[PDB]
A = this chain, B = another copy of it.
Amino acid sequence: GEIAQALKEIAKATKEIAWATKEIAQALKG
């Protein structure tokens, strides 16, 4: 579990960063 669980948590957080970064890009374009 520990290594697999940490990688799953990194995956979830990285997906959230991706979405927020897309929102920033969209805001800056208008």
Contact = CB atoms under 8 A, between A and B. Distances in A.
Contacts of A24: 20-21, 24-25, 28
Instruction: State the oligomeric state as a number of copies.
Output: 6
A15 to B, nearest CB: 5
Interface residues of A, number: 26
**Binding site secondary structure of chain A:** helix
18 contacts: A3-B3, A6-B8, A6-B10, A7-B7, A7-B11, A9-B14, A10-B11, A11-B13, A13-B14, A13-B18, A16-B21, A17-B17, A17-B18, A17-B21, A21-B25, A23-B28, A24-B25, A27-B28
Interface of A: 1-4, 6-11, 13-25, 27-29
